Symmetry: C3
Subunit: 102 residues, 3 copies
């Protein structure tokens, strides 16, 4: 694809990763305040946002693997940063809630 397509998709990712990010942090706030029902609900919601903007990552990487030359985009790079850090938080949040739960 061209640079402009990569930039727009990067923006989509920045949007969804950003949304998932706020939900996960709000979940941490809820857990801090002993409101675990809300904490869990929020995490479950953040999960969908991530799954959506994530499955696109796979197809993108597979294309380069199979010979496609993908153009550089600072926006795409930025979206991936948002996505990957948010995913790490998602992968570790259960323990944070659990620690607040104990």
């Amino acid at each position: 694809m061209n640079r402009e397509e990569m930039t727009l998709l990067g923006f989509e990712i920045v949007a969804y990763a950003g949304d998932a990010r706020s939900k996960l942090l709000e979940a941490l706030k809820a857990a801090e305040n002993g409101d675990f029902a809300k904490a869990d609900s929020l995490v479950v919601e953040a999960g969908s946002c991530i799954a959506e903007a994530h499955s696109s990552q796979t197809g993108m990487l597979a294309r380069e693997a199979s010979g496609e030359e993908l153009p550089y985009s600072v926006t795409m790079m930025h979206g991936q940063d948002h996505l990957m850090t948010t995913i790490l938080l998602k992968d570790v949040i259960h323990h944070l809630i659990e620690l607040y739960k104990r």
Copy 2:
């Protein structure tokens, strides 16, 4: 801009991010040892280094969004990784301190 400018800006972001991270880690060591006061101040200090490194971020996105082709730089990419991972630490640090403060 040229690759040289991107690289140098990258070094700049790495320096600020690096210091922000060291302080956040140091803040953790403090909270672990009960020095919550030292931990809190350190967290505030970290935020300033982050504000600096984070500065150019929006501008870069805007330039590319308006149709400007920004050069690829490993150093810049690495700086962005440092910044973004450090910002996540900053976003979570409060809960790790609180859990230590309970």
Copy 3:
């Protein structure tokens, strides 16, 4: 080097970081269940893999700093995201284990 070469090194980075990440997450599961000796074991193993990927990172950045032009690769940008998020987790894991240990 060419893009293909950059992509191959990136795959290597993803392998080391992905493996390290699963050990660190497994280390978290262990600590959660009170198996602290297992937790430390995994963290020590993960560090070995991280050391191999991180060392490779240093050389690359240095190559650009010395004037060398390196090709952009989505896989390398992805491997770096994996490595960088994994290094953050490794730097913060001790405090998570300790919190479960308290």
